[PDB]
Symmetry: D2
Subunit: 301 residues, 4 copies
């Protein structure tokens, strides 16, 4: 029932939507995944959106999935991705999620926005749609969304809003962006803002050093990134980097467009969290060889 | 209750979704628009999709709008745009529309498809989703959708399908594509296929000469394009081009991204078909000057 | 020998690079084209760049072509397109052109620029490259270059520069941009700036009304647009629009990507200005049917 | 003087173009880099192109740089990137490079190609331009070039050509592509073809297992990838992966757009190979913090 705040930190797991082979939602696995995240020290869970294959679900299914996760994660803050082609759908899912118990929602910009004018305007319209009372997360992921946001544009989006409390940092290269944003806070031009990093965790080791508050990861070993985040906050540089480096081979293997979801679901099933590694169409599973390669990386971990 | 066939021809009007200023759907205008299209000789109506601001409606609203149009156009074939981010939503709207009385549905490819392999695969998955029994229209509009489809790719998509009965031709330049496709039919590699042209009607005059069956137009004077199509089919080249040329100034003014919808709704309201020219956010109305310019073009018509 | 100024106005013809069938530069036609432009009242000529198939010429050829035009147009201001992948090549061609007698150069942004920060920075680097003493033209053509520049960004680019004297306006929709820019000049935030319009002349009729100074056109009848510009400046609205409307059918036919150059060269040859309508690879000529269609439009003119 | 063949294998170093702070080419460093590559076991060197900042050099400079490298690498095969906006420039640089002693040239497709028809056509025009006698390398790097080529399209490009002897594999995900291509060779539909991998070496460990012949790397430790390639060919899986994993942290840090070149030049200077880490505009050097981070990774190696 707690609203997301700018002080959010630690590790937020990005949850895939569990499916059986026929494509039906696997609720048992949703609960199992949720219990797992809590058990290993995750502070929150992000649901739906692209990684949760939300585009492959119908309106009613998306609401049910988001609700299942929200009700199960009683001790964690759940963030629901509400990015949509239009504001009506966004408002519906956002309000529903909040009434259900969500901590807040995540909003990514449409892929067509180019000028900084179009970017800031979109988000003002977006917040007007979901309501200024809804805590939200700004997703900055140029690699897949095309849109590029400068630190100054991000600062404007946040300060123009009543409730943007977090930035899901996925810019690549994006290390300097973190430093710049923290600098704005130091000079007083930017208010409190949580910065959780993504982009498959490819730069989590240095992102923590730059000043990120934690990670919002879809990595199949969120339990181990919990330690990377902890070690980093503890100033144990060598220990943090040693653990990160041990996971980097698998982190980068999973960090492949399309194949990434197949890798995640394959491992989560192998870990006993998912009953099936199935995805809904469009989506292809790992080849026998890719599975062996993933197994090899797992064996070295 | 008639299913769309490859013999579909004439003029199909692309209907905007009528809204009042508060953004609520204006059902009275939906009926008024529908009666208008029938009265002026239109053979069909295409609803929802981008031009109908479908992305700005929620699931329930889209279904209601599509249904309102289907039930009103008793003597015309109604095509419902079902393009969507995922197959579940597409299947829902497609089946609902068909059960309601739609003649068929329209499917555009996602903006990311590049290889011809990805294009043909997508549509096979798309038809599997809506059902091979549903007549559908392939939308080819590179200008706004980015995807480019060669005549051979189009031929494959059609022949791979059980029910693709029409191509909404919007390629630009696309005159040679029509000729090439008609050639495939002549040599026997392509079965019957209706070709209705779009892209704001910018090349309708020559598209008819190339062999198109008609137009699927969002132009504010569908009643006049009905005559352009008729004159063209009658071999009255000079008369057809004289009428087209008289409309070209306004056709091109309306053929502007973003401003186009504002121009259409402004004129349809002025013609007494819409109660309000309102659009839902995001969307901006015409400036006082743009309105005057449109008025000037109208006065010269 | 006159440098381009913010007071530049009238009609500037965009010259194609004349080639014979073997692909060799046709110098006789370059002189013939130049004499033609001067004879019909053109105030200037723009050479090289995409429309002049500059990407299909080697460094030495580009310099020779630009020079041939500069030396021939003794009574007109010649603008050389210097857009390039790098600043070294840009500086070379710019300085060479100026030493030869060019009035100034044109610079378009690379297709990757998205943030307004990247846009303004690029042009500051661009001017540093060619020299702050070189008068230049800012090309704004989103349709083909992808980059989008807001009026405020344009204002910054101009005011940040010592010598940006003109904007080649090709935004689409772009009528409001002209009005906004003229407004900045009225309020004093923007200094004198020439605005010549492009985008195939698709909106020249209204662009003149908005306050453009003239046209920079590649249209095969620059002689007739000279009159459209004159009539527009004379406040003869009906006469201006009547003449424009008579040309719109051909203007729009030529306004097709790829086919456009083929249409231009075909007509310029038919008008006796080019010995051959040949282009260098990659490039395809008009089909027999397209030629007939162009002939039909010409006959109605 | 040896021409590149389909049997090319091992490690090919992608050479940056050494510059001093004033931006002038540093020939002493070109020789030093070349001697280094030979000394550590590299089989070849690739010059110019994007990584060599070729777009920042003028025609004469590019030819001089390519020539300097060709003449110095007497015992290695040198590949010159000839990708260009037009065929004239491509032919000039290709023939010049071959006359100088190059083993072959590399050709990447323009960023606009989408249909497989456009892709295969481009390369047929490209080979016609440089001459069918010139051995060349097909660059497949969607991440930066946008163009996507299916294995079948690649097969067609190769079989349509008289001299395409190598594929610079940079697809991501691209492991299955290697397997598919090797399969075509097994079934006889694809002739001998060298496959050297790129994309910063992010997947070199598994690419070798899939059947790649080696690497074409811009990584600052080409000497160590020489061993990774050797260990991989020797079937020493654990040793190969242990060494790769030790370098992965730095490999991924350098694998950042824009920052990548700064990282490479910074390290190559620190290794005593470059006098200066300077790049030509546009290009920014590493911040003090980024330098420290790179130093940290280096210290752990």
């Amino acid at each position: 029932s707690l609203k997301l705040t700018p002080e959010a930190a630690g590790t937020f797991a990005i949850a895939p939507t569990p499916f059986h082979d026929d494509g039906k939602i696997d609720d048992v696995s949703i609960d199992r995944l949720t219990d797992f995240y809590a058990e290993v020290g995750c502070e929150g869970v992000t649901v739906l959106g692209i990684l949760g294959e939300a585009p492959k679900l119908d309106a009613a299914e998306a609401e049910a999935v988001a609700t299942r996760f929200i009700k199960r994660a009683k001790s964690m803050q759940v963030i629901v991705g509400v990015s949509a082609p239009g504001f009506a759908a966004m408002r519906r899912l956002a309000r529903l999620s909040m009434d259900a118990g969500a901590a807040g929602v995540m909003i990514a910009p449409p892929p067509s926005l180019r000028t900084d004018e179009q970017i800031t305007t979109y988000f003002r319209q977006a917040t007007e749609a979901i309501g200024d009372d809804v805590p939200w997360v700004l997703q900055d992921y140029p690699l897949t969304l095309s849109v590029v946001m400068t630190p100054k544009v991000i600062r404007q989006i946040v300060m123009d809003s009543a409730s943007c409390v977090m930035l899901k940092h996925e810019d690549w290269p994006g290390l300097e962006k973190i430093t710049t944003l923290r600098g704005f806070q130091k000079d007083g031009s930017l208010r409190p803002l949580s910065i959780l990093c993504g982009n498959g965790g490819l730069f989590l080791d240095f992102e923590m050093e730059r000043g990120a508050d934690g990670a919002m990861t879809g990595y199949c070993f969120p339990d181990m990134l919990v330690d990377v985040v902890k070690l980093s906050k503890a100033g144990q540089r060598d220990l943090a980097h040693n653990l990160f480096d041990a996971h980097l081979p698998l982190i980068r293997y999973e960090h492949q467009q399309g194949v990434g979801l197949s890798v995640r679901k394959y491992v989560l099933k192998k870990r006993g969290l998912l009953s099936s590694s199935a995805q809904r169409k469009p989506g292809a599973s790992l080849t026998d060889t890719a599975r062996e390669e993933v197994d090899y990386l797992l064996s070295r971990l």
